[PDB]
Design an enzyme around this catalytic site. Sequence first.
Site, PDB file in Angstrom:
ATOM      1  N   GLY I  29       7.412  -1.449   9.514  1.00  0.00           N
ATOM      2  CA  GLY I  29       7.553  -1.503   8.058  1.00  0.00           C
ATOM      3  C   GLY I  29       6.716  -0.490   7.296  1.00  0.00           C
ATOM      4  O   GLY I  29       5.936   0.258   7.888  1.00  0.00           O
ATOM      5  N   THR I  30       6.877  -0.480   5.973  1.00  0.00           N
ATOM      6  CA  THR I  30       6.157   0.458   5.103  1.00  0.00           C
ATOM      7  C   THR I  30       4.691   0.050   4.972  1.00  0.00           C
ATOM      8  O   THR I  30       4.317  -1.072   5.312  1.00  0.00           O
ATOM      9  CB  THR I  30       6.779   0.554   3.689  1.00  0.00           C
ATOM     10  OG1 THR I  30       6.598  -0.680   2.985  1.00  0.00           O
ATOM     11  CG2 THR I  30       8.268   0.889   3.757  1.00  0.00           C
ATOM     12  N   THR I  31       3.868   0.966   4.469  1.00  0.00           N
ATOM     13  CA  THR I  31       2.429   0.730   4.365  1.00  0.00           C
ATOM     14  C   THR I  31       2.092  -0.123   3.141  1.00  0.00           C
ATOM     15  O   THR I  31       2.654   0.071   2.063  1.00  0.00           O
ATOM     16  CB  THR I  31       1.640   2.055   4.287  1.00  0.00           C
ATOM     17  OG1 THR I  31       2.116   2.964   5.288  1.00  0.00           O
ATOM     18  CG2 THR I  31       0.148   1.811   4.500  1.00  0.00           C
ATOM     19  N   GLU I  46       3.577   1.005  -0.439  1.00  0.00           N
ATOM     20  CA  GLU I  46       4.501   2.136  -0.361  1.00  0.00           C
ATOM     21  C   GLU I  46       5.944   1.635  -0.440  1.00  0.00           C
ATOM     22  O   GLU I  46       6.354   0.796   0.364  1.00  0.00           O
ATOM     23  CB  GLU I  46       4.276   2.894   0.956  1.00  0.00           C
ATOM     24  CG  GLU I  46       5.355   3.905   1.327  1.00  0.00           C
ATOM     25  CD  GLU I  46       5.139   4.530   2.695  1.00  0.00           C
ATOM     26  OE1 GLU I  46       5.583   5.678   2.894  1.00  0.00           O
ATOM     27  OE2 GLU I  46       4.532   3.885   3.578  1.00  0.00           O
ATOM     28  N   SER I  74       4.071  -6.222   4.756  1.00  0.00           N
ATOM     29  CA  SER I  74       4.813  -5.180   5.460  1.00  0.00           C
ATOM     30  C   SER I  74       5.618  -5.806   6.593  1.00  0.00           C
ATOM     31  O   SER I  74       5.155  -6.746   7.239  1.00  0.00           O
ATOM     32  CB  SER I  74       3.853  -4.139   6.032  1.00  0.00           C
ATOM     33  OG  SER I  74       3.137  -3.489   4.998  1.00  0.00           O
TER      34      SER I  74
END
Lengths: 231, 244, 195, 240, 235, 250, 111, 241, 243
Positions: I29-31, I46, I74
Site C-alpha cells: 500500500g501507499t505510505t 500519500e 496503509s
Amino acid sequence: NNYDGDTVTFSPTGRLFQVEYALEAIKQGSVTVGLRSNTHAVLVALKRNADELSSYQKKIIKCDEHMGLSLAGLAPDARVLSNYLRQQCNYSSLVFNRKLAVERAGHLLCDKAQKNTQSYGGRPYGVGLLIIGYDKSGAHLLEFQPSGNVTELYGTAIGARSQGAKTYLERTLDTFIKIDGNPDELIKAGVEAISQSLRDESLTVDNLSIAIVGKDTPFTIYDGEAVAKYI
Amino acid sequence: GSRRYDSRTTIFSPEGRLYQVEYALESISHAGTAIGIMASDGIVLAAERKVTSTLLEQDTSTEKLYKLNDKIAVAVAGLTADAEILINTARIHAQNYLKTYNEDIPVEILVRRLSDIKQGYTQHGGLRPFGVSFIYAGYDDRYGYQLYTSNPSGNYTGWKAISVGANTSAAQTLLQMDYKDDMKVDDAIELALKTLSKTTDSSALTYDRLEFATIRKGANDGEVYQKIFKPQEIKDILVKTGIT
Amino acid sequence: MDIILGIRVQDSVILASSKAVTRGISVLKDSDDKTRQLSPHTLMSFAGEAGDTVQFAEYIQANIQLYSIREDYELSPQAVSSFVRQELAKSIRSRRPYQVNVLIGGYDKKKNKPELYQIDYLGTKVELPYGAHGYSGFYTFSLLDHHYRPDMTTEEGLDLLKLCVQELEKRMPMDFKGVIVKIVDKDGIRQVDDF
Amino acid sequence: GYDRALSIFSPDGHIFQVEYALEAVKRGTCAVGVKGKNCVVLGCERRSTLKLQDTRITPSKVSKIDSHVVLSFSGLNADSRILIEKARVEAQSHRLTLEDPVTVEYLTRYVAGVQQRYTQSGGVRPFGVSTLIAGFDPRDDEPKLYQTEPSGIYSSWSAQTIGRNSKTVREFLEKNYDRKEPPATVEECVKLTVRSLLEVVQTGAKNIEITVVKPDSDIVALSSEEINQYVTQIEQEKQE
Amino acid sequence: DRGVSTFSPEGRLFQVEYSLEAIKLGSTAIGIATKEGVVLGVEKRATSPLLESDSIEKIVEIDRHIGCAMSGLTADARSMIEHARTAAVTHNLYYDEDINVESLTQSVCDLALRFGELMSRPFGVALLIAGHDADDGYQLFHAEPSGTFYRYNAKAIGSGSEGAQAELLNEWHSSLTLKEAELLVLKILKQVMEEKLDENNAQLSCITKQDGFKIYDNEKTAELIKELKEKEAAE
Amino acid sequence: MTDRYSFSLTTFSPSGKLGQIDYALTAVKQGVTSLGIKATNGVVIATEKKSSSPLAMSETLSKVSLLTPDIGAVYSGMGPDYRVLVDKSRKVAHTSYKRIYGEYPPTKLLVSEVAKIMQEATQSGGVRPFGVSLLIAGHDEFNGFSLYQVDPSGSYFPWKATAIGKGSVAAKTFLEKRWNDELELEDAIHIALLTLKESVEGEFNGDTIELAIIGDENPDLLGYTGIPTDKGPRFRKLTSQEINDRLEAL
Amino acid sequence: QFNPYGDNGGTILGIAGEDFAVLAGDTRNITDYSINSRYEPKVFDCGDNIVMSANGFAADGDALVKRFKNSVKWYHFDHNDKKLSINSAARNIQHLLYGKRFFPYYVHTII
Amino acid sequence: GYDRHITIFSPEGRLYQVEYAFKATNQTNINSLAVRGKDCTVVISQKKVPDKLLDPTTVSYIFCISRTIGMVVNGPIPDARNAALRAKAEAAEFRYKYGYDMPCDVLAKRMANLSQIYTQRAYMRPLGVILTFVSVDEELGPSIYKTDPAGYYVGYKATATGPKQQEITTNLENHFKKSKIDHINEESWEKVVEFAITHMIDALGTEFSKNDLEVGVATKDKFFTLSAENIEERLVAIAEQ
Amino acid sequence: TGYDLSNSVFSPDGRNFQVEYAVKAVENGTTSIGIKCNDGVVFAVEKLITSKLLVPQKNVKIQVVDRHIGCVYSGLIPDGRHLVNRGREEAASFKKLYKTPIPIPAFADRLGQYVQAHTLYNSVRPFGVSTIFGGVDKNGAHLYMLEPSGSYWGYKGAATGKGRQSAKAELEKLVDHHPEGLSAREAVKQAAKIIYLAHEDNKEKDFELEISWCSLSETNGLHKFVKGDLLQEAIDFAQKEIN
Ligand SMILES: [Cl-]
Ligand SMILES: [Mg+2]
C-alpha cells in the site's frame, strides 16, 4: 492457485484472489461510461443482448429522485446493492428529512462489499457500479469496485474496452467539466466517449442507454426512441 | 474455513453404500458375539464378554445385557458407551408411552423408534453413527415373544434365532441347523450355549466370560419374568448342559 | 353444546348428545352431532366452549387415526382415554386452554367389555357405569342411581336413557332440541335414527 | 447446525449424491406395480439369503399410507420409514383441513416434494429410495399408479417396476402389457404381476409378496398358498 | 472440496455454470411472442412407453395472465412455481390488480442466488415465463439459475436449444399471427426431437389477453400437427 | 465467526477403528502409572507425582481428587483434561443426583455420568476425545466398596484391582499374584506401595507419591457435630508423613 | 397510566365530480381547549394524482401518510415506474391500517 | 496431515498445535524470573526496545490484573493482552459473585481451564503464551503460579521462563539447595528485587541498565510495577556491594 | 506443510503465516505516517493520483474517531474503514457508559483486541492494514501504530506502507535533533517533507498530500484537517527541501 479457494485466504504476496476474480467479472461486462460537469452528471451505458430475438440487458438503475447508478458484471448483485442504496437513501429521507449525500452513499457501499471479503462462506460481489447524483454540494460521480474501493471522479468508464473511453475523457477533461446548464451537450460528450470503446458494433436505438441528473433535473433514464436524438 | 477437515459422515459411495455405516459394521464384527433364541414359551439371551481379565469384578458388572423395562431387554454388540446413550433413550421412550397410554409399550414400537434415531445419524447432522448392534428380546400381548435386531444403518428385522457381533456367519449356520419351531426355553438355553462354545475365539467357554438372560412366562399365571443370570447361575447352567 | 350423557350396560356403551347449537337468543341449528368416531370401536362425545369443542375433537380424532394406520392396530378405549386426558392436562396450563368436556365410550375387543370414561377440561378422568357433563348430571345421576342395573341389555339401556331425556325436557330451562343416540358394542358404532 | 452442501453440481452438470442415491435403489429388492381395469396390484421381491426370519413381525414391503392408498419401495429400508411416516401424517392432515382423503396424485406429489427438498438442503443427503404409490381417489373407480425417485421427479405409469433387475422385468411388462386392453379382472392383473417377478426372482415360494388394492378402501394382502397357486399355474402353462 | 459460492479465475460462479450444463441435458422447450399472443411448447420425452405421457407436466399456470414452461431438473421447478403463484396472488391481494410479467419474473429470479453456506445449491432448471399485462403487452422471459432474466421475442431452451435458436432467428418477424407461431413451435420441435413428434410426446400452450393462459388438448394439437405436415408438403 | 465445526472429528476408518480414541489411548499409555486395589473393608488408589521442576511445589498439583465424600478419582494421561473432568464430575453429582434425591450418587452411577461426558467428546461436533483413563474408587450403602476404570471411549469396567499408564502391563501382573478376596485395607495399601515402586524410578517417598483411600467414615473430618446420621467422609488422602511410616515396614 | 392516543380535532371532506375530485380539510390543530396551530395542513399530494388525508390523532395520521407516500415510492421501484391506480392505492392502505388492527391508527382516512 | 493443523490427536497421541504454540512463547526472545520473599513476591523480566521510534513506557509484558494479582507474559503481545484482559474480567467477576478477592492460584486454574478448552475444541486456537501469576495471597502467603498453552498449571517456590530459562532455573535450584529453604529469607522487598536481578545477571551473564529490565512486586494488599528510577536505585545498590 | 492455507494455524516455528501474508498487503500500500509533538499528534498520507480524472481533495483517506482521535492506514483501504467503524462503535459505548471521551491508550486496546480476534479463527481473515492513530486526552498526547497481528505500541514517530523505511530514517533524525520536543506547526511541515521524501519509493504516479492534526493549543484538543493556507505552506516547505 492454492490460495483462491475462498475470500478468507491471503496469498503469499498479500493478494485476495476471489476478490480479483470478482473484479474479472466486471471486465467481461458490457461497457458503461460516467461523466459530470458542475451542474449535471451523466451515465451512458452500452446494453448487451443474448441474440437478435432477445431484449437488451438494462444497465441503469434509479436509487432516488437525486441519485442512481449504472452496472457492469453480475446483474443480480447490482440489484442487491442498488436495493441496499434505495433503502439507505430512503432511511435518510424518512428519519432525517435529508437527501443522502452521494459521498455517504459510496461509504455505505464500500462497507457492505468489505464484509463479504473477510468472512467464511460468503463471496465478494461480482459487479462494478458507476453512481451519479446531485446533492447539497453539487454534481457527483462515483466508481464502485467490489473490492470495496470507492472513488470520486470527474469522469470514468468500466467494462470491456473501457480504457478507450477512459483515455478520451482524460483528454476531454477541461472541455466537458465546463458544460454547465446544458444537458444535451454533456450527453453528447458521454455518447462520444463510449464510442471509443466500440468494436464492429455501433450505437443503435435499442442498444444505447442514457441517464441524467442535475440542478433542476431528477434522475431520469432514456431508452428506445428517446435516445435516437444522440445517434 | 472448517470445510477442510470435514469427513462427510453422511454421504453415499459411488456404489450407493454409506461409508460410515459399513465401517461401523466392520467395527461391530470384532465385538463379543451375542445370540438371541426365541422359543414358544420364552426367549433366551446369551452373550460372550470381551477377553476378560482375572481381576475383573464379574458379579457387579454389566457389559452386554441391559434391561429396558420389565418386559423388554437388549443384548449389545459394539461400543458400550454408545449403547448406553441409546439404552437411556429407549428406557425414557418406554416410560413416555406408559405415561401417555397407561399400557406397556409394544416391542416393535420401541425398536422402531430406536432404529429411527440411528437412521437420523446416517442422513443428517454430519456426526458419526452409533457403532452398536442390538438384539431386542421382549414380550407384549399382541405378538407375544419377539426377537429383533437393529444396526448402525437404522434398519431392523425380526427373528426366530439370531446372532450379532463376531463370527455371525458361523453362528447363524449352526442355529439354522439345530433350531425348530416347537422348541422349548430349556432347549433354547442349550442351543445358545452350544453355539457360542463352538464359535468362540477363546480356548474354552467358562462362566466368567458370559452374560446370560431369559424372558419366560415362568412366573405365576399369565405374567412375564426377566431373569438376568448371576455368575453362580451361569456356572450351574454350564455344568448342567455338559460344557464344563 | 350443553347436554351429553353416557350409559355403560352389559354388552354396550350408549351415548346421548343434544342437537341444539344456540348463540345469543337464536337456535342456529337443531340437528348437530356432538360426537366423533376416534376408531371403529371408540366414540367420543363433547361439550363446552364454542369452536374449542370441534377443534379439539377433530385433533384427537386425527391422532388416533394416525396411530391406527401406523401400527395397523386399534388402541384400547383405556389407552385412548389416557391419551385424551394427557392432552387436556397439558392444555389447562397452556396460554389458552381447551375448554372442552368429553365422554369416551368404547368396546374393548380384547376384554369383550364396554367402557365409559368421563373427562373434564382440567384432565380429570374417571371410569363410570353412567356419566354426564354440565348441568345434566344434577338430574340424571340420581335418576340412574335409582333405575340403573349393571346387567341391563342395550334395549333396557335405551329405555333408561329415554327416562333421562324425559326428565331433562321437563325440568331443564333451555330447549336442547332432543338428542342423537349412538351405540358402541362388539360390532362397532351405529346410530339410532328414531329417538 | 450442520450446514454442509452435500448435494452439489459437478462440472458435467450432474448432482452425484442424487445419482449415487439411485444406485442404492438399484441395489434394493425388486418392486413392481401393475394396474388393471378395476384394480392396482403391487408385487415385491424378498431376498432368500435370510432364512430363520419371522414374517409375522418383520416390516412388510407394502405400507398403507391411508385406507385407500398404499406405498411400496426399493432402496434403503431405514430411509423408507421416514418417507412413509411423513406421508401418513400428511394424509391425516389433509383429511383434517380439506375434509376429504388425499388423491393418489396429491400424496405422490407430497412425497416427491420431500425427496426433492433433501437434494438442495444443507447438511442432509438425498433419500436412497424410489417409491411406487398406488390407490384410488375418493369416490372414484379409476386406478392410479405413480412412481417417485430420489431426485424428486414423479409420474404416472400404466405399469412400472423399480429396484434390482428392474430393467429385465420392465422389458417383460413393455411387451406383455396392452394399453388398449389392461388386465380386465383381479386374477389377470395378479397373474401378470407374478409372471413379471418370476422373470427375476428365483423361486415362487416365500420370495414374492402380492398386495391387491381395489376401489373404496378395499386393500388385502395375499397369503403364501394363494400366491403359490399362481406360481404353480404359470409354470405348467410354460412347459409347452 | 471447495466453497459452493466460489468464483472461478475467469470471474464466474462454478455452481451456476455447472447448473447450466444440467439444463442442456433437459428436454426442449420453445416460446414465441406475437402481437396476438405468446405460444409455449415443450418436448415431453417419456423415458418408457408404459409411462402415461399426459402425467408429464412441463407446462404450468402461474396466474390467468401468466404461464410457464420448464427444462432441466424439472423437480427443482416445483418450489419456483409455488413461489411465483404465491407472488402473483399476493400482489393481487395487496394491490387489487394483475402483477406485471416482468415483476413476476424478477421475483422468481430473486430465489436463484439465495444459495450457499438459504438452500444448498442453485436450481438445475431454466424457465420460460410467458404472459400479458396492460403496460408492456405480450412478453416472453427466460429465467436462469444465475438470477438473470432476458426478455425474448422467441427463445428455445434444453438439449436442442442452439439448433432451434438458430432456426427461430430466421423464422421470427414482428407480424407473426398466433396460428403461424403455433405451427412454428411444432415445426422446430419436430426438427430437434429424437423420437417422431405427435400429440402424445409434445404439448402446446398459449396466453392471450382475452382467454388467458390455456394448455391445448391432445385433440387440438393433433390437428395443428396434421395442418403443419400438409403445409410443408404443399411446396 | 462462530463454531463452524458442527461435524464429527472422530470417525470410523475402513478397518473399523475409531482413530482418535485409539490415539487418545496412546496418550494414556505415555502417561504416568496409577493404580487401584479393592480390599474387603476399603479401596486404595495411588499414583506417582511426576514433578515438572524441583522449583515447582508438587503439593499444589493434586492428581488424586475428591469427587464426593465417599468417592475419589485418579488418572493416567493428560493432566489438564483430567482437571476439567473432575470439575464436571463434581458438578454432575450435584445437578443430576444430589439436588434431586438429597443424597450423593452411588459409585456406579457417578461413573456412568463421567463416562457419558467422555463418550460425547467422541461423537459431538468439533471436539477431540479426552486423553485420559480414570480410576474411580468409591463406597455407597447398598453396593459397598467398588473400583471402576473409565477409558477415552467412555467405556467403564469394574475391577478388583488394576493399573493404567506407563508400566500397567507389569503392574497388572504383579497385582494378580498378590490379590485375594480376603485382603484387609492395610494389606492393600502395602501391596499398592510395592506395585508402585516397580514403575517409579527416582525418589520414592511421601512427597513423590500420592495415595488416597476409601475406608471407614471419618467423623473428625466432617467439620461439625450434632447430626447422628451424618458420620463423615470415607474418602481420605494419606499425608506425606503417613506414607513414610508404611515405607519403613515395607 | 400512559395514554398513547390523543385527539387533534379538525375535519376533512371529499367530493367526486365527472372528470375531477376534491379533498378539503381545515388547517386548525388542537389539543383539549388549546389551539396548537392555525395553519397545519393535513391534506397531502402523495404523487400519481392521489391526494390523501388521515384525520384524528395527528401523530398516527402523519405516520400513515408518511408510510403510504413511501409505499408509492417503492411501487415505482418494484414495478417499472407504473402509475399506482386509485383502486390499488385504496387496497394498499387497507393493509397498512389492518396491519395495526390490534393497536390501531386513530384516524378516519380519505383519498 | 490435517492432524497437525487443528487440535486433534496424532497417531502417537500428540497435539502438534499445542506444541507449536509453546514455540511461539519464545518468539519475543525475552526471559522472565519469579521469586518469593517472606512478605513479598518479586517478578522480573527483560525489556528490549530495539526501535528508537518506540515510546519505551508503552513497551511492557507485565500486567496489573487486580489490586493484589500481577501477571507477566512470555509470548507475542497480542495474545498476551488477550490473556490479560480476560484475566482482569475474570478477577473482577469473581469478586462480584463471591464477595472476596480472587486468589492467585484460583485465577491460574481458571485461565488454565480456558487454555485446556482450546486444546480440545477445534475452532479455537491455543494462545501462544505462558502466563506467570504472582501475589501475596491472604491465605497461602507469597504465591507464584504459571500457566501454559497445554492447560497445565502448578505452584512454584521460584520460576523462570524464556529462551534461556534452563540456565536461570538451575541457578535458582542451586541457591535453594544451599539456603535449605523455600524462599528468599529477606525482610524488605527492595533486597528481594536485588536478589532477583543479581541471580539473573549471573545466569544470563549480561549486565543491565535501568531500561534493560522490568520489575513487578507483589506485597500484601497491592501489586505494583517499578519505574526506571526505582530500578536504577536498585541497580546502584547491587553495584555498591 | 499446508500451514499457511488456514488462518489461526500455528506453523512448526510458532508463526501464523496468514498474518504475515496480510503484512505483505500492507507493504504493498501507499505510505502513511504519524508524528508525535509537544501537545498533540500529526498524521499524513500519500494519495496516488492514478488519473487526471480523480477529483482533487475529494477522496479523503484520513478518518476521525469520536471528536479527538485521528486514524490513518496503509494497505487494503476497505479493511481500514471496517476497523474505524468498529473504533467508532467502541468509542461511542465508552462515552455512553463512562461519560468522558475514550482515552487514547484505552482506544488503542479496543482496536488491538478486535484485530487480534481476527487471528483466532479460520472462519475470518486477518486485517490487511497497519493503522497509525492517536490524539489528545486528559494525560496529554499519544501516538500508536497497530498491525495485522493485533500488535501495537506507543510511538514518538510511526510509518507504514511502501516507503516506510525511508520515512522511518527521516523520523529517527527528528527524534535525535529535537530531544526537548517538536511543535505542532513544525510537525505539520515535517510531515509534508517526509511524505515527499517517502514518495521516492512510489515515483511513477505523482501524488496528492493530505495532512491532519490534533493539538491542545492549535486545534483545542480536537481532530482537524490541515487545509488552505496552512496546507500550501507545508507543501512549499516540502518542495524546497527535495531540491
Ligand atoms: Cl473453569
Ligand atoms: Mg369429571
